[PDB]
Amino acid sequence: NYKKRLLGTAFKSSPFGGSSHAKGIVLEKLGIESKQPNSAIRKCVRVQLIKNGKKVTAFVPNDGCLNFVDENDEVLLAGFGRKGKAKGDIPGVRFKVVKVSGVSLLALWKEKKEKPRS
Amino acid sequence: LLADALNAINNAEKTGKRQVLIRPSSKVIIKFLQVMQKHGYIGEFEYIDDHRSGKIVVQLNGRLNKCGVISPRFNVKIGDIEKWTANLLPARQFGYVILTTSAGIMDHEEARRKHVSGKILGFVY
RNA sequence: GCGGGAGUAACUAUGACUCUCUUAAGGUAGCCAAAUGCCUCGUCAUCUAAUUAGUGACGCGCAUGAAUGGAUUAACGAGAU
RNA sequence: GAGAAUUUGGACAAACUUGGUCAUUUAGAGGAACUAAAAGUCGUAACAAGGUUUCCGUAGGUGAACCUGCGGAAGGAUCA
RNA sequence: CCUACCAUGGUUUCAACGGGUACGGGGAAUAAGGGUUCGAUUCCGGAGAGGGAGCCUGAGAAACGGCUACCACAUCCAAGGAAGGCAGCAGGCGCGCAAAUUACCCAAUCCUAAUUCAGGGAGGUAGUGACAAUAAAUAACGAUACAGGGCCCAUUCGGGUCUUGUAAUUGGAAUGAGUACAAUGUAAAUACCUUAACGAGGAACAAUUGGAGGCAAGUCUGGUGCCAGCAGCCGCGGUAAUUCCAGCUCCAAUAGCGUAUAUUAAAGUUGUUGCAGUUAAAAAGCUCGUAGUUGACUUUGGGCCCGGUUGGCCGGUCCGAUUUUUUCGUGUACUGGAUUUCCAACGGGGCCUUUCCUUCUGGCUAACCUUGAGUCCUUGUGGCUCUUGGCGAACCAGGACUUUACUUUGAAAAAAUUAGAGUGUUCAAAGCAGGCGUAUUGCUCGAAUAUAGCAUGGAAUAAUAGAAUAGGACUUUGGUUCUAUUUUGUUGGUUUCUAGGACCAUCGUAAUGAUUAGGGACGGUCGGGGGCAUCGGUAUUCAAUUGUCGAGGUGAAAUUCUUGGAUUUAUUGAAGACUAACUACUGCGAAAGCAUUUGCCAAGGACGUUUUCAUUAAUCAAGAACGAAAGUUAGGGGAUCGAAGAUGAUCUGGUACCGUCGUAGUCUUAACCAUAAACUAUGCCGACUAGAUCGGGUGGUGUUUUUUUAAUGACCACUCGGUACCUUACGAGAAAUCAAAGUCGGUUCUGGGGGGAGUAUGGUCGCAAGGCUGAAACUUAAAGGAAUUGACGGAAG
């Protein structure tokens, strides 16, 4: 048949499959800086997946600066940057870390605050 | 020959020529212009001698908004007339599609009365 | 025939660039530990019962450089691992 | 006359082993390039006619953005 | 299916074969539809049972719970040797974002075995989880007391309507669930349903989540200070933060709320319906031509193909039972939807076909589909009239009836007119129609087949040979003989009818409407289109010689050139390149491109009366040929100017501009590479719509030129082609502007954010520099076009 060569829409995500989230055993906990318009050291982790086996960097927001996501943490990894564009301040991250989840539930939640959860 | 045809008579009505001056003769010109006469879109017509082919005469009366051809002569059905009548005529109630039916060249709603399919030539509204 | 001494970039670490002395005046395209390397089992990957060859580079160039020429690049041998 | 077991011969299906050839993936000496990022080095190329009008194609040469030969364009006003 | 032998074919750019990927359909999601994306559950079909092999048993198997040998795994074992395969249910381990009990049962339905009745991890049920939909839904009433602000009315005294608070307020009523008792249906089990009375307990079984700068309903105060933090986008946080954090303060929805996945919509952003290309991304450098796609035109039926509309299955409605619009079953009708392939009927569109025709001689013989009009009948609409159901006319559509008519020929003085003949064939059945009981004939309906004759072929007619069929005469009953009819082959005279071949004229009028669409021959004509061979002039340079003493450059300068006589002035000789003026708002060539004069070979365009073949045409991926300049190879040549290279000057530097010299190039033949901001930034071809200049042809009964008068002219009217172009109304567009780049078709090319990139890699071409074809990771939130204001200039006035 006829058509010009159309490419289907591609999410800029190195994990694939048909899965929302993913487990990952982690290497290190980093604290990287950012691009031009904003300062502050923003926290990240080097998540290596089990099923897919890809190296990704993920932003860990939390009300805990040195919150527990260590070297060998079984952390759950979601989207945010898969959904929408990738983040402006600290580029490279396009994955956000989920709280208290997975099989083992090692990575902790937002602490020192007593507004409703999230 | 099809392209030019309905554009010449349309531009005549746009400016407001009382008679329009058109010409050819062999055997796909004049009886849908009698369907136009029945519907009250044009008036009278006659024939004048030439050296080769012929000369027509058509009397107008300031009716045509846009007529034009359907340049590929597509197949119309006795159900799907109005898929074309949607885009061909921007108005419904006004205008008609001229089908080249199996029962000669006639109107589209007349074609549903006979229950006859065919091809298409042009629109008038 | 084709240079020395001195000072200098966040931070381990380096010298872009700048000054000064000296002489007639101080080198490009491209490549490197050599039929040439004091220093050197240098430094790294792969191979091997050990394996420095096979083959992968490192930069720590005693002392690479366009006509008695760099460089593109197929065929052929009682010649070399 | 029949059944079991043994031997010889014919034809069929597919596996296993060895060699050659092609594609893909991983490890990898080694080699070339890009993107992002503060400060620097050297020149003023581009930007007003930026004080030699620019840019693009192509060829040669230079520490360096570059300079020069040749052609053309308006991406200099006006239809050069 | 298989082998032996023989032939050499078969398939393929309408995509073979290979590689990668994938079960397929009914269907499911989204959408207005077109379409796009999927193939879970259900249902139908195929294929598979640790791996690989083979067989038996049997009607059915090369067999999940069958068998044998072999291999790998894990297991038992007296070590001799055996026994195994959860892609059946429940469950274990591992994988993962992640998905449920080692439950109950044969009652009901269905399958298996005379019935009883037994078996079923099929199935009918239960348990687990907001997983989703759904309903109840996140709660709502009659009555009374008091306080505050707003509005209608007011006799101003109050009264009415009406609710963010408040009170041990009062009367209460109400579900969901448990428990005791009664009553009910199926049971093998777990949990029992429904109504009423009485007592007790709990209570509409605890309401949370998200947002508050714009997009997107909703702001204030504290605290923190680029930190802690939030971020889908653009962004916010470094002291007065509606964006962080907490409060109170608001908005929206609610048993769900937010996030994440992924498809579709938004998206007319892959355009079939339904997209752009002068300047934003986009016409291939230009010609030419094959396959392919498309097709001016008269009259026709058949054949072929495309496209319906109607009937077959399912659902709803209709009917019966029933409380029912639940649901089930049967029959019929209507309506809607689906699988997209076959048959048949009915009207098309596109596709295909000839004046004429043996000859002395006579010229001989014969004819049209259909359209249109009229009349009758039938249907629908509207008007008048009836509570509503009747009537006359017009018009639409369908059917029937209908000839005048058309034509080849004769007789006529001509001719009116008249006389004769014709307007398809065959077969079976069913209906109606002359005379008769019928038969049979004619017409209509439906099919099949074919659609100018005289070389040729068929029939009639005659002869002869073979075969078939019927009747008669005979028969030692096989057969012979005669006659009639049909069919096949062959021959001849005459009569009648049918195919096929060559060549030419005209364009008539009815179905898209001011149409000569393709190639030239004949005769005149223009041009810097091409290649070669000659020739002329000016300027420059070099060489030789005379008369005569310093020049050349620049902003100043110097390198440089001169007393060994330069510049120069004149004469003489030589070598190469270019052609001032004419020269243009000019012409030619499809584009690249083309300037002295003359000659030869040789091409194309435009005009004119015509003559003439008769769609021959248009366009065209691939393919073929041609190619400015720069570059390369081999052999020549080098006057005039010069990349590279060498000196002088300038400057902070000056590897440049400037000045003095000078190499390759620049020129030439042959061969190659093949590109340019290769341009009108606008594809080719054909028809519609007001207004210059150059070339051809015609006219100007008048005037001028002028002595081979050719004035080719002057100057004016037109009529055609090219159309430097100018200028402009309608109209279009985002606008500048265009005058089609407005607007239309047939066909071909091309675009889908910027950077990465015309790069990487492979293929292909090249002698080599390099050309052609041609991405992604990743980065980012914009790049870009049209149009404006103002500052500035070693810009102007």
Q: What is the DSSP string of chain A?
A: -----PPPP----S--SS-S-EEE--S-EEEE---TT--S-EEEEEEEBSSS--EEEEE---S-TT-S--SS--EEE--SSSSSSPPSSS-S---BBPSS-TTT--S----S--S---
Find the length of chain A.
118
Q: Is B61 left (phi over 0), alpha (psi -120 to 50) or beta?
A: alpha
DSSP B79: S
Classify residue A113 by burial, with Cβ atoms within 10 Å: 0-12, 13-18, 19+.
exposed
Strand E, nucleotides covered by protein (CB < 7 Å):
95-98, 208-211, 226-238, 245-247, 259-264, 270-271, 273-274, 296-299, 306-310, 347-349, 396-398, 507-516, 686-689, 730, 743-746, 751-752, 776-781
If you write DSSP's letter for every residue of B32-43 in order, what string do you get? Answer: HHHHHHHHTSS-
CA of B11 to C1' of E682 (A): 26
β-bridge mates for residue A32, sequence order: A42
CB under 8 A, 24+ apart: contacts of A109-118: A109/A62, A110/A62, A110/A63, A110/A64, A111/A62, A111/A63, A111/A64, A111/A67, A112/A63, A112/A64, A113/A63
Can you give the C-alpha Rg of chain B in angstroms? 15
Whether B75 contacts B48, CB under 8 Å: no
CA of A39 to C1' of E238 (A): 10
**A30: how many CB neighbours lie within 10 A of its CB?**
13
**Structure method:** cryo-EM
Six token digits for residue A16: 């694939």
Residues B17 and B14: their CA atoms lie apart, in Å, by 8
Q: The dihedral of CA B84, B87, B91, B94: what is its sign?
A: negative
Angle at Cα A54 formed by Cα A69 and Cα A7, nearest 5°?
Answer: 130
CA of B5 to C1' of E718 (A): 31
Strand D, nucleotides covered by protein (CB < 7 Å):
36-38
- Residue B4 in 3-state DSSP? helix
Residues A61 and B114: their CA atoms lie apart, in Å, by 75
CA of B32 to C1' of E219 (A): 73
Taking alpha carbons only, the member of B14, B99, B23 closest to residue B58 is B23
- Residue B85 in 3-state DSSP? helix
CA of A11 to C1' of E760 (A): 24
Resolution to one decimal, Å: 8.9
Strands B96-101 and B118-124: antiparallel
Nucleotide nearest to A101 (CA to C1'): E97
